[model samples]
Target: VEYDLKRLRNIGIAAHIDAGKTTTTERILYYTGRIAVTTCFWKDHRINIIDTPGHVDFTIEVERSMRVLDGAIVVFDSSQGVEPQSETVWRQAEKYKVPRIAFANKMDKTGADLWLVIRTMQERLGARPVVMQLPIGREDTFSGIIDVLRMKAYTYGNDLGTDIREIPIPEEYLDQAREYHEKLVEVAADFDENIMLKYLEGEEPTEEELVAAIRKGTIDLKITPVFLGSALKNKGVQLLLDAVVDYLPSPLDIPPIKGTTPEGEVVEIHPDPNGPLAALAFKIMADPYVGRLTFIRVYSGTLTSGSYVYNTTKGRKERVARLLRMHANHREEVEELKAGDLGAVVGLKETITGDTLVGEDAPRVILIDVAIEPKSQALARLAEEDPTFRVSTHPQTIISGMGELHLEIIVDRLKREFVGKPQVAYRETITKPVDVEGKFIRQTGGRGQYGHVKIKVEPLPRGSGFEFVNAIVGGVIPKEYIPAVQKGIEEAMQSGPLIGFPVVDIKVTLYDGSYHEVDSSEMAFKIAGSMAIKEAVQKGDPVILEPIMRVEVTTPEEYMGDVIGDLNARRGQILGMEPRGNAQVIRAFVPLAEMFGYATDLRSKTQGRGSFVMFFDHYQEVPKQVQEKLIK
Candidate 1:
């Protein structure tokens, strides 16, 4: 197939919930005649719009969307410039450093004002909004828009938006258009000094020069060009599409995609169809008929149907059985997916979200500790679809997710059938050394059974999981049964007596033992060894060890005192606090048990303006008071 990397744009639509992002996307589809397609073409340029989730509960989806998007159209309700979730989404976009344009939607709604949107864009988001279009009339009278840059007008006669008329700027709005046009040029000069020189020399720059400067500003993320429209009533949607084509960066405009090899070396991936294949699995779904679907963004090279691709993240090879270009619920089978293309592949086994799939010939491509509990086969299928939703088994059936609402959403969806206070993985260990002897003898009047063992159980440093020492001499315990002794001790250490938790950081030595040659089999020694460990551990002053997490909370200075107080209430040890930009980074060590539900707690403490990250650091002996309550 033919590939035009320069003409390919990978963009996403993002907004706070109820901001009309979906409506804007739907209108774009209708205007581009792609009423049932994700990819649309306008002015010979191919634009692939990613419809990302808008809920704060689905933040991971938005994060992944930003990771692969070259640009974004952040929609805002004209009256509600920046809502709570809007700030959250803006922060996500900022984290990804995604270049974006702002669309003030619902311009025809009551109380809509362009100036309010621009003002809040600056005050709330700390963004520089370069107004590119001016609303012709206030809320109820919002029938058209005046293009400041082009000094023209766009009026929609029919609600279908197919009958768009372009005429000279209206006499009444002429002065406002010129004023805003002057401001646009002023912002453009910041990105292109040549424009500044032309303006100072009393010479007007050409329309191409102004557009080039604005495009430079947009791609560089120095400014967000603002456009206004009423998507539901079908107005200014086409102009926004033109702005997308004119201001947004193409795949060729961005720097090479960075990846890492298995050896930890950095690699640059350019958008070239002939380059080594490197694609990313951003989303996964389970199709009742197709089985599994992996949505991939091919950053470089080409992917063909039935070809094999190496999953560098999992270090496994997967077959690309079929490729489908998705249009909502519809699918169009394609032979090959080229660079800068987004498509779905059927029959992916090991690939999950955030995995890098590379061509078998290319070097390894660049790349959690969180887990979940509780679920069945249905949850298993759901887990494949959401990377953040995890299901962990074995020690206990635990399910972990982004938040309470996150887990709730999963269980509620499964009811379509079936389901914490997350439990901390507390451990058990000895505090002192103790020696014990265990003997088992039973004469059944057949083959008599007899086993004896003497062991010394000592406390090891933290994190030194169970270790076995064979110190027997002169075949005291015999060679064959020694392994069984160690195996029994290992299994015995699994559930400690303190709180019935696995024993860690302990050492055991089999210094002396007597065995009856006729009755001392592996099973006999195993029983004897198991008996010895339980007695030794109980007598050695065993105590519960809780997992301590290294937590870093970034909060504003105003909430630093409250955050520290809350951590202290949780028996947390505050390490230090450092200033990071305008926020305070409070580093502390808090027991994982206390950190349960801290996400909701922190939000309430900081007014949803703070965030935190924590990971298991080291295990420590539980405080005497905490152990007292836990043991009971």
Candidate 2:
């Protein structure tokens, strides 16, 4: 209850692959070296950092992390500046309106260039980036950094741990530092009037004032203060940590959690220990020793161990048997977690991500799923942890989005094996519109049953999945039985008429239905609904739809033609090609069915110098020849 809410920072570190996110996180923790929750300290303030994986395939993890995070530290590879993948995470952060600071990592790399990063940040990311620090030396000779705002310099020794020292700005770079510092002030002035006043008076603002102005702008999401450093070299991380403490928004700074009560009234949940208990479960991890761990951020009130809390989202009451703090692999047991704090609670039977935990006395809240195999149990655990993943029984137990790499990790984490090459998860849909009637009348027994429904099935645009419209009039179908009919249609959609694959991009409408009040039950209506959809689909010109992946292949220029031809041979529709560094990037929409074992072929085609990444884009109807071949 006595925790300093203003000093508590909940931030996430996110970046693209090979951007040194993992290394930078390690450096930050190593420098701050302390034993606590998934928490670190910088100048006595607690900074809670979530380790977000850097990859497009794990975008769900990044998405969840971005949602719960008050702020973020987006790391960029200085050598490459802003990469295509970097823009994905950037857009995610912007979608959540999560203010962030940028770290230009890998300054020691040969091609490291800060201006390129700044320009790309503006051009590609649409970010207003403010230079906070300048690298003192070029690549390999990289030694120090100048604090543009403070007009000070810092040099670090090439050692295992930090051996940082303060120094005066070099004379040769003084003019540039002054120039950037003025630019920094110009941006800061818009956020803080005091800086504007000082600028108009021709008076220099103090370091503290400058930091306050920058902090304001950062929290407001108007400017991204960029800092340069080499995480591998263990240089400038401490300065980065300091920048985090100075700029990143604390729990007190972000607006209250806008949640709705069970009564459908909007409520603002502030960070107050004495207020009603309110918390959100953002992550769920299965630990070997602890069983299920539910990571939560307490927005208000206090959460005590051995207390009963309601999972408002799930409408179930769960016991907080034990509360534990996470420091990567390490764990610390705690009695209670207060408002504006984060901790994990164990022994929750039915709670998952995006669930709100509240006291029975408190009004319910707002927020915003999956599967795996035998190892199915392991798959289930992984699916719970990753929201984008799923496990289903479509005739065969299927564990599936993400991609090859994600499933690879799932298998690897399961301590198991998966020998089969990757295969496409195709879908089924209908093209022509058709109407059909289903009548379920069983009058053999004592209690007669009668239920009838007429539905129209038609094609929808690609990626629309399935949509059900209740166009019944005059209460032809009882309202309670409507959902049962919809459920029946949905369950029927689990396997399509053409190839038994899950259907997509179709709309089903129940325009007419009749029921016998005494005998007609939900089951009758449901059966009738299922019967109608199955009948309509047969006459609706059903077709098999294959998944098309948005593929990006980066290969050396010499292999550009070969790669393009190979992709074309696989029935890929080339989108375009562009140059990236010394390589050519070819973009295409390729059927995933033809993408299996592609890595092997691509490697052989490009002499093991080519690499490609692809994710499911949309579903397209297979050609007549391809459908005939599949059916045969």
Candidate 3:
């Protein structure tokens, strides 16, 4: 399974839709000349890259993409750089610890400031950014880039912009370009000893040596090399392509891919063709020629066509009918695929996205008594999900305390934990007093039934919950039937009439009723009580009660401004922020609805060190403007 790590570059192009990721990838594909054209690279070394889609279901595309990717080139706009998905994609790369390069595209567009975009990258990403290329000239006249490490400039031409000509660094921006180069060298030197020695000796390193140093630093993830170009104009693409091959990792470059046996024993798969077969089923697509194309990233061993393999995910053996390398358009039927290579295999009975396929001997380490494990119980706990979030006996799914991001994480957990679709939990309550008479009198030839009940529904103060009052004076409601009437009302309270939410903070009184001596039973009276309460609640001005939260955050003073800005945007009212040691403890009252994804934002804004806590402060009527929208 030992393959050259430097030769492979499993990179993902992620930065929202139209960030020019797929465009950038198309340019790189041209270099390999053709595949039917699936992959490209330097000489025999191949770069297996895919341009991922940005869609509602696209996050999983990125998730599956990252597992095989050794590095990524996260492209952004020259003007509109940081989208919401930018951070999400960035974190996916981080989650896999994949090294990456930031590409600032659309240099030909107006408002293109190469330096400004690089600055935004550093500030928004909070990473060590090294600008390797500085685009010269203004938009529309955007010609080429100044190679920061080599101190050389290039201009693009030939209508197609594929023809490139080396040029001298313009004297006008020589000083400015030199300034960033020194900074680049400063950061790069710390990562590579050779670069450090050269810088210390005040000796200029060779171009190859400089790129080597930068490449080392980039793969180490200590320095993020920022490149610029206008892909649409075909300017600066070759250089970006160069960066992909020069700096991106091969399968051998990254740490061993970690796995767990069915027994939960840790396993590391080396990218050696001779090693135990280990490949991940990253994606599955139906091909016209082939029945189902299961794309895989081989981390270890090799897969021979027609050989038996085990789906560790399903814990079953399957035969590989055919093996093919994909180039998106067409495919070449190959006999085998070695470790460190990406390919598609045909003839798998049931291989889904993210499945783990291994050699026939692949140990399905189902832990002893794995069959007896409490999957449903575990699934149930995860369904309830968070401690801060609670569900009622009838299962109201309002997730409290967690902001949207935290709730999103919880939802994601539930998505993984549960077998089927899960829905949101909404609540219902009341606002005013109402009285109604529910009479159910049915006199059939055979033993007729009579159920008459008078009930009064009154709204209580917030958080008073529900109270049952039997205020009958004339034995209107039989004592034996009172409990049944209350039970029916309780069940009916589970759903309110206004918007069918769980009615809360309300009082129901069984004040009066009439019954038939021969036909009346607890069932008859229960039916009357439930019907009366449902009607009474609608008359009582029922409304939905949204969960409010007491949110507190302790962060350093530098982040106070950003925190306050976000809090306001997130619909939080500042209670006050107190000085707590070196940190300011900011307190606020925020609606749970507005707090979705708060945990994710604070942590990112605070570099994962920013801390916050929240609890169900109380429940209040949703504002007039929002009540209608929230009710259904």
Candidate 4:
């Protein structure tokens, strides 16, 4: 039950959609004997692999997984090189400081070019990969990989296993392999001063010296060691595994996480099993049978069953009911988990994602920052489908009474749960000039309600929000009802007369009004206020504003024109462009709606050779063309 931190490796497989990350993961599991067979089932597979969605829509899941992984195998299709989501995930890895190695998979497929992929990584991704292994041939002839570090040859048959043999360099590839080997040595030399001095002095480096330099370079991220293979054919996977164990750093290799104590003192959590228990919850899964399962990575100390832990993020105490080691969908019940290991636990209340679970005595806390934005939003209009059916009515009533219960159950059971996410209310406002009048007249039994108001509406600067000014100081309207009028106006703004979006950045003034002492109640004033605001908005030439995002596209130089043109068609404004290696980095501002389908389009336009990262910049008025569709 006690595994050394160095022996444990926590790595994730990440790539652009259809770049074969899941296929590579499947091969790894099969090669390691963790799975008996490799099957091609996208939806229902029993393998314990976290097959993350590669589309930009599921960025939250990708980012959350990256935070918990110590290192990762960044898989890229050898034929297509790098991709847009690859750039996004690369930035995520950088944010988390996760060191990784590059796997140029699908080397046997048509158009597969390992060298082109390596050059793209160096030019676009700013990674200088030390060529640890080189493919023997391109496309279908790629039957083996030449190990530069070990100076050995590995050939794979049709089966998913390799045969190691020592042989002289093939005549045709000898010169090419030598050239890349020399380049690898040169890159590796930068990380090792002694090796660099020897190489500069025209002295050869020993095997040990070369390996030490490679490991150091890889761990420091100065070099991304490249390995080429076809995961579907199960070629070179075992060697990749061996390289993972050799190059990737464990938790102990990383610096302790810095945090603040409850008393405002700085503290660090070292990767020590004997230290106070501290784990970061990176993911949360709601299961009907298990309630809630939290996936966590223990950074320090040991986590044991039946222990009380403090949730530093939530500022609450929670009981640890059971501990389980997760391998994809399958889990093994375990009594304890040491530092630098991934595990899951069930039955935790009030502990959501990004929470830190610590020992009761540890005053220090660890905070994990992840990027997970809601993809879409839709209004929840509750309606009883069958009000006459006894069973249906009862279930509907129960679901309404217990908010989110039905949603939780359906989300747990369905695969297409991402659609129709709960709507996040956004404020809208009129940005033009308008004037209107309001009158409320009613008769009820012996009493009557009478109120009248005239108001002018104008737009404020963006983000100024809603402001109410009372100019009726002469007592044309009682001071008590003025506040009620403002309240009613705000309520009406929440449900806009044109659309349901909340209203913002507009000013309303109660300049004039007539009131009756007995009839001018709060309700009457409220009604008058609503009527005036709606009337003014109807005349105000309103426009809708959507969120804009700042985007950075890093792509090969050859694809710059296509990428920029594509952004322009999406209503994006290219702000600037910079040169990065053999690639171009383009920065732009684009609307969120236009970017929803950008991931798919970028892949197609760039032929999978480009990558980009995007973040929310601000809100701006929708383009005239987009507004036409939106209003309809």
Candidate 5:
């Protein structure tokens, strides 16, 4: 929390499901140069790197991580190039305007092609891929990388990746590397007019000029410099770090964070530790040691330990009792957190994520991971342990989380708890209106067993679970048998006929029945009530209701047309579109069936400049024709 403004880098490791982001970061921590000890900057500079799940199921981990990060290292699989989830995380970074560098990792895999991945970036991502390092020998022979900027080669020696030996550019790869190096310089030079002019006149530009131009272009989002490496082999980790230091933007580079005063005036908070205090709480956790741990990014603020900072989001002041720089889950206490640094603070009970904290004088209206809610006994224990993940029954007794995959996993846990048949989230509702009567009569040998009942079943209002009534004449059916009819109706509602899900929103009435005194029993009438609903369901014309998701997507202007078109193709109705930030926000009601894997499709369609989030809205009956391939 006390690093120099220019020395701080709040970055993230983002990539597809199997793109090696985790492996690369671990190797970065393992090696010596620009050590990444869970958190820190490139070289001696400081960085707070946020990590997330690569798989799309819990990709909200990446979603929220990008929201707080300043830049990202987007890892790609060299052999497969860009994948579905790759575009998703890439677009997430774009939505935040977080400058990024590309690492075409997994060069050790069979049929690895760094250039292919770069081409995919240019074509699919619609961003210029600046190739800074070329793989020396790809696939099985991948050993190291040739740094185009320095024209120096980096190869690993003994010492288990601790020893990175500097060597001359290998003779065999020299020509191929030069070709790509020229392409890299060309992209960097084009973004800077002076350099482009110098090159137009056929004058040679120095390596310093090229590096400076590359950094500027990268920060400007004019290009994403691509670095090739086999993170698994630890072949190119250091060069990747060098590129991080050289290309990625620092705290001083990104635009000043926007905030507003309580009087409603726009203001920008610059990065100055000596200036007025302003920090944004990006994450909230109920830490074991600290009652409520709020992770904050200081922008033009100095948070002294035990000092009170005004909560701009909540019109109140909160005392900062403790301050510490966090590396993964561990923290080291600090007396103060200077601007341009990120740290965890305790005793800020009033603060939550996305709340802005400023000096009391500047209090204003403002602005603005990973542990999914557990299920089973773990759910109860976790909810009991961290107040952050409490499971309370509002309408349904369930635990919701910030992760898609994690939520799915717990959903499975929940489904198993209600075992018997696989549930289909379905609803059996009467399409029209119908009324039917059911009767049960029996004359067995002993005492002439006889039970007769007449009941009418009608459709009730939606969400109105069920209603049971009796409009009977005196002694039409005995009082004991009458109670059986009501009990039967309640049990029959458990499984509807349409899809064997639950049946709801219907009313049943017992108007008439006759029973023999000896044989008349609750057991006979109970079966009769269930039988009445079966005929009632047929006459009422029921259909199964499938869940619908209200989806909202934020995309750049140029891609709005394509996104809407694609949404329509998926049977999604475009509700409306409005301007959001520098993007267009499109809201739609999409069937869950059509929205399956939409994250990947939308990202690819928008060239990684779009992001969307959806929630379970409502359920509507769908014809069988509309049913096909869908998410389980």
Candidate 6:
């Protein structure tokens, strides 16, 4: 059987954690007959659905999936409205330019106000969704939905069967359906000239034309369609699937994926099954059995079994050992994957996440933007009991203050087995330059080792990193031993004198030093160099410089005062504020330490209507209170 990329709707269900995205996905699969049963375990079934975690810490996974997805069903909890992470996911969708449909799930729960959630989306997310389907009843009475466009009622009972019947529009919701249908017509008309002309002429448009216009409007992101339902009870899910087939844009409907050549030229790859083979590796998984698996979305051409592809990100060649289709946690062997399909290739040693896999001679590299950053810093230390087991120790020394072992488990799993890279530890240094002299003397039964070296240490401009310069042109210290001295200094900088953080933004110069003719081995010079740098750091009066981040928060206007107060409490300096529709955008520079628990705090403060994005700004001197705490 052949499938057209234009007919494939690659959509994801995304929202904040516990927003019923997974539940909605399960219901959609069950209602569409893609699964045999309507149960929560359907999420683990092979339904070609990608269920992403909603926690902020698992943002990398969310980002990877969104890049490859053509559209998404953004599941927002009706009672809670838009959460902080919801804004984050929305922002990511915007960055990818992926069009979306909004699903106000869990409408049967307490405080589940569909209008309030829709209002929150419009006011906070700047979305204007056409109410395609309105709830017949809210809370426990939510048993059916009113199709505004079709002027029909879709009733589903507790038995959760395909026994849905079209009935007369509920009298209580008839006026609402008529009002929203007119609103939908207005939004749809904006995208279709013919529809607009007909509507202006007071002529009714054909059902086909109206449907096409609605689809066009949705693809252009001008009109987001909102549907209400409770996934827990399996209500209004089949209608959502029908809407997905009706409204969401297929891969071929989207614009060609754009990329840049090494020479800075632009190129585009269309979603063509017969075009040159090109795929983007968006996710990487390490299975104990398979070793490594790369998830890729083919943009052009076809990938056959056992083909060699060039990895543009790593600039290496990788052989495709096995190809398989992924449906959540299940996998099925496939002979080949055509364009617009998501597939997995096993046993690729060189391919990593975010790599562009293409034909041997493909020129351009497509890189998708990812919107996640490391949450915290820790020191990767070898456990005393288990020498080979390196643990990322929590920065906090106090046992009560340390994050739970579960946090460490995920980090260790990613660092050791998944990513196959150790966590990079960093150090900070204090201000002020200091010069110091040092001598290394040792005596043995047969021989003695003596070495002397002098060095000057100075602070560099913030973010300049470390610089090593050699000022010894006279050969007072031999050229070969100078590198040994520099190595010693760098090793000492790994653990700063005060705190254990790696030292950064400092410069060391080997100006002059004396060396014993017979005892001046590289070892002796290395020891002397280490001693001299330590002495200089002590004299420099270095105080710890902690990282600061540039944070931008978006929230409703009512929460502006509270957000500002919260920022002040974190010792953050408000850079500026801008009005974003009904919400406010607050920009500030805040210490990294202050942002540890900010995600949870923001959720509470905004009543789940706020969102934020943060990036490394610059390092600032630790405050007196923080510095004192670190010392203690």
Q: Model 2: number of clashes?
A: 3
Cα displacement (angstroms), candidate 3, residue 132, comes to 1.8
lDDT (Cα) of model 4 = 0.68
- What TM-score does candidate 6 reach? 0.78
- Winner on lDDT between 4 and 6 is 6
Of 5 and 6, the candidate ahead on lDDT is: 6
Give all candidates' CA lDDT scores: 0.79, 0.79, 0.70, 0.68, 0.70, 0.71
Which ranges in model 4 have alpha carbons more than 4 Å from their true place? 34-53, 56-60, 80-98, 119-126, 134-144, 162-190, 193-207, 260-268, 287-289, 328-330, 364-437, 442-488, 495-501, 505-526, 536-632
Tens digit per residue, CA lDDT, model 3, 1-632:
23464566676676666777667777766656642116655455666775464531233344556666677888877865554446545655655678899888877788677766667656655677788888787777777578888788988874375488898898867998899888877776776777778888877666766777788878887778888987777878778777888887777778886787755678677877776788887666656677667777787788888999888777678888988877645567888878877887888765566678878765552110000000133334443212244433344234332333443454566666331212333467656788888777776577677788898888787757789888888686778888888888888878877667677778887788898877887778888888998888777766777656678775656688899889887678888878653357788887767765566788788655455666556666667667777654
Clashes of 6: 7
Candidate with better TM-score, 4 vs 6: 6
What digit string (tens of lDDT, one per residue) describes model 6 on residues 54-125? 564433455667667777888888886776557667766765678888888888899888888878777767
How close is every model to the real structure, measured as TM-score?
0.86, 0.70, 0.63, 0.71, 0.68, 0.78
Q: Taking the tens digit of each residue's C-alpha lDDT, what string does model 2 give over 161-193?
A: 536778899898999999999988888789888
Evaluation by TM-score, superior candidate among 2 and 4: 4
**lDDT at 220, model 6:** 86
Clashing pairs in 1: 260-366, 372-392, 372-398, 372-399, 372-400, 373-398, 373-399, 414-417
Best by TM-score: 1
Whole-model lDDT, model 3: 0.70
> Which ten residues in a row are the worst by lDDT in model 4?
380-389
lDDT of 4 by residue, 116-235 (tens): 787777766777777888778668888767887656667676645645555566766677777777776687688888888887886778887887778777778777888888888878
* Model 6 CA lDDT for position 512: 82
